[PDB]
Amino acid sequence: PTIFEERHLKYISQLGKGSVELCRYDPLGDNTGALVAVKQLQHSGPDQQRDFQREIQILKALHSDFIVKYRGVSYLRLVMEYLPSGCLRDFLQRHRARLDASRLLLYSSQICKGMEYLGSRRCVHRDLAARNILVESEAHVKIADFGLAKLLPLDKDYYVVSPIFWYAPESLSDNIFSRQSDVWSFGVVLYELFTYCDKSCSPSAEFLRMMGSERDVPALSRLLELLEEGQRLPAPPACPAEVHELMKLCWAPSPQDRPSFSALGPQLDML
Numbered sequence: 482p483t484i485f486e487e488r489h490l491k492y493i494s495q496l497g498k499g500s501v502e503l504c505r506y507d508p509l510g511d512n513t514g515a516l517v518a519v520k521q522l523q524h525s526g527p528d529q530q531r532d533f534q535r536e537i538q539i540l541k542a543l544h545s546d547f548i549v550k551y552r553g554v555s556y557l558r559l560v561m562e563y564l565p566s567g568c569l570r571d572f573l574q575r576h577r578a579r580l581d582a583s584r585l586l587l588y589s590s591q592i593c594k595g596m597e598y599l600g601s602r603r604c605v606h607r608d609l610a611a612r613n614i615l616v617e618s619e620a621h622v623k624i625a626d627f628g629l630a631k632l633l634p635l636d637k638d639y640y641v642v643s644p645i646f647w648y649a650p651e652s653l654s655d656n657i658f659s660r661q662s663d664v665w666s667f668g669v670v671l672y673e674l675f676t677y678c679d680k681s682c683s684p685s686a687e688f689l690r691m692m693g694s695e696r697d698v699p700a701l702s703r704l705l706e707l708l709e710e711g712q713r714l715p716a717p718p719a720c721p722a723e724v725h726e727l728m729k730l731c732w733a734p735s736p737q738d739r740p741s742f743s744a745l746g747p748q749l750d751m752l
């Protein structure tokens with residue numbers, strides 16, 4: 482087996498905390514090696530470990546320009562491509578003044594094409610949020626963290642099994658996840674994009690406000706009560722009304738009434 486030999490994976494810095502670190506894969510020892518992102522588990526708890534082998538095989542199998550590339554393994558460590566610009570949540574709040582609604586639409590369209598591919602592979606990400614979207618360059622974004630990703634059963638369109646503010650009502654109430662629960666998450670991502678990930682009006686900061694002053698009432702209970710009423714995240718300030726309408730559709734109470742990614746794609750592209 483031709484792997485990323487541990488002795489050749491030269492550590493540089495941390496990308497996130499298991500954990501992710503930036504390494505230079507230098508098999509020739511002449512410091513001419515390529516920079517790769519390397520994922521590993523730190524406090525290796527037996528259940529998180531089986532989840533890691535599932536994750537590796539999923540990413541290995543996915544081939545979208547909008548999903549992070551799998552590179553290989555080291556030994557367990559998952560080797561992937563390195564996207565230097567970092568997290569989309571950081572990128573939006575740092576360069577907010579230089580990014581217009583047309584550029585946010587380019588990101589929405591790229592995440593959408595990414596998620597559409599995911600669906601055709603009968604995979605459910607489950608953690609679709611701006612915190613797990615990476616930046617290639619100011620004109621290209623890629624989806625990351627397949628840590629929570631689940632493959633749909635060969636006979637079923639749903640799957641019963643923490644990020645509750647991106648979770649659909651069926652996810653909240655009965656732990657049901659499908660491509661349509663990722664459409665609900667996509668609607669929250671559009672909110673994040675169009676608020677430029679402002680800490681002030683984050684989906685987390687906004688729902689807590691809506692939940693009220695009764696903290697002993699379980700979040701899962703208070704959030705579901707709110708989403709059953711029809712209460713939603715507000716229209717982002719200055720957000721194109723055509724976009725906030727697509728957000729509302731992603732937020733339909735029943736999963737069958739939410740648009741598909743295949744349907745959303747042109748609607749985004751044609752604005």
Ligand SMILES: CN1CCC(NC(=O)c2ccc(Nc3cc(NCc4ccccc4)c(C(N)=O)cn3)cc2)CC1
Nearest residue numbers: 495496497501518549561562563564567568612613625
């Ligand atoms: C501790 N402190 C360290 C410094 C800060 N971090 C960064 O400045 C950063 C710089 C480059 C980054 N590029 C990455 C990260 C990756 N996974 C990790 C990741 C996934 C999704 C979102 C964020 C991170 C992958 C991959 N192929 O999956 C590829 N490229 C990611 C962050 C904040 C956290």
